[PDB]
């Protein structure tokens with residue numbers, strides 16, 4: 001049972017296919033159309049079924065060419081409203097029918113952000129993009145909005161002819177709209193079954209550049225050249241990922257660089273990974289996010305979590321593969337450096353939530369929890385830490401990678417639970433069951449807080465970061481003169497970020513130390529978003545009033561939640577910036593992504 005879905009479960013009926021025909025109306029901020037669901041009964045004498053919806057207007061439901069009865073239930077908060085459909089003829093087990101639902105979305109759809117021309121790079125055209133994970137697909141179309149059900153899909157999308165539509169699917173042509181010569185229809189096919197959280201749409205003034213044999217980058221024209229360079233390692237990462245995971249089954253691997261309000265670093269929409277433009281550091285240094293989205297083509301998109309309580313299966317295995325791709329490209333010492341950084345992010349999340357908090361468990365219970373409120377680094381890093389621990393326990397990365405490949409092959413096209421994973425781990429490692437039974441499974445999977453054992457990490461690349469951080473933390477006023485730009489000369493961007501992260505873990509530092517850091521290191525000049533984020537948090541938490549306009553600008557000029565939520569929270573916690581933080585939120589809230597708007601409002605206690 002999926003506690004986040006109000007739809008008929010997969011034991012009752014299963015959507016096999018969606019045919020979406022829709023029109024994007026930027027004047028009304030609506031998507032209007034038909035969703036034709038091919039549904040297979042899983043029981044005898046099926047006479048009704050229930051779909052998820054959220055803020056959808058339903059015009060009619062058509063089966064066998066006639067309108068049928070349907071009823072929308074009372075709204076259940078973030079879950080939306082269940083839609084019960086009375087079938088005209090009882091179905092036997094395995095019988096399939098087509099249900100055609102005529103619907104329109106709400107301008108406030110939590111799946112969608114509608115941008116005005118002034119919010120875009122080009123300033124002439126508007127822009128739309130979706131983000132369905134976890135349970136926002138129901139705010140675009142009626143569906144069994146659960147990852148326990150996988151379907152293929154086809155779509156035809158009518159847009160103003162000056163604009164381009166793309167989806168999480170193979171492009172299947174474009175024509176003038178035969179109903180309206182001011183519009184174009186773009187067609188799409190997704191022939192690999194997916195959970196519906198992977199459906200995605202973008203409409204805007206998009207251009208493409210080829211960067212590899214199976215990859216185009218898409219953005220507004222102003223970002224194409226920088227994006228092509230930034231993501232040039234993509235084909236190399238795809239080849240490594242195929243070596244680790246088995247064949248790439250999805251045909252194309254395109255990248256779409258969204259406007260700056262995209263809420264996440266990336267989203268693994270099949271055939272078309274969506275990425276934040278905050279990756280555009282100019283030196284490819286944030287390419288781990290691409291390695292992570294590539295990895296999801298296996299762990300998440302092929303093997304899927306059955307319910308959101310088991311989300312760690314998706315993210316932990318993806319971080320694990322991501323860090324192997326980066327280790328194959330840049331060395332094993334680098335993989336251990338990134339692994340140890342992730343432990344630090346886990347320490348931070350556990351300290352923030354508290355060590356007894358239920359969202360620090362690996363397997364969570366999202367009954368009556370908004371999944372967007374539970375989202376954190378925990379499933380990423382506690383999930384990675386478990387796999388990295390098991391790697392060490394079971395004989396190292398070569399051996400554990402054999403398990404990963406076999407796991408993907410076993411559960412390809414399926415939706416699974418933690419128990420399914422664990423049973424297969426035990427089956428695969430049958431000759432090492434004595435080692436597996438040493439694991440404290442109850443603590444790792446079901447207990448809050450830090451895991452009960454910390455893995456072993458190579459320290460080679462970390463040591464200079466720790467040493468410099470400790471020099472600053474232990475410095476007194478009379479030591480500040482000893483710091484110099486030469487301190488950084490042998491540090492990569494990754495090490496500078498880790499130096500900041502280590503130092504931020506001990507924040508605040510005295511204001512004179514932070515002033516001295518700017519004087520000698522000129523961190524205000526650095527445009528790398530991860531470095532800048534941690535530098536600005538360090539400054540604000542250390543009560544540097546000069547950093548307030550910089551922090552407010554970064555919090556509002558982009559909307560990646562990783563950056564925006566903690567910058568707003570730091571600014572609200574500094575008495576000198578509190579009022580500006582709340583005022584700035586209130587002035588921007590109407591033109592924010594709807595999920596970001598909600599979560600920053602929760603964080604700032606501003607309703």
Ligand SMILES: Nc1nc(-c2ccc(Cc3ccccc3)cc2)co1
Pocket residue numbers: 133134308309310311312359360361362363364371372374375376378379
């Ligand atoms: N260990 C652990 N898992 C979670 C968790 C589970 C599911 C989700 C849903 C979600 C929401 C938004 C975007 C992507 C996924 C979030 C967190 C927490 O702790």
Ligand SMILES: [Yb+3]
Pocket residue numbers: 044045092
């Ligand atoms: Yb029957």
Ligand SMILES: [Yb+3]
Pocket residue numbers: 172
């Ligand atoms: Yb075709």
Ligand SMILES: [Yb+3]
Pocket residue numbers: 158177179
């Ligand atoms: Yb039409």
Ligand SMILES: [Yb+3]
Pocket residue numbers: 423426427
């Ligand atoms: Yb078993």
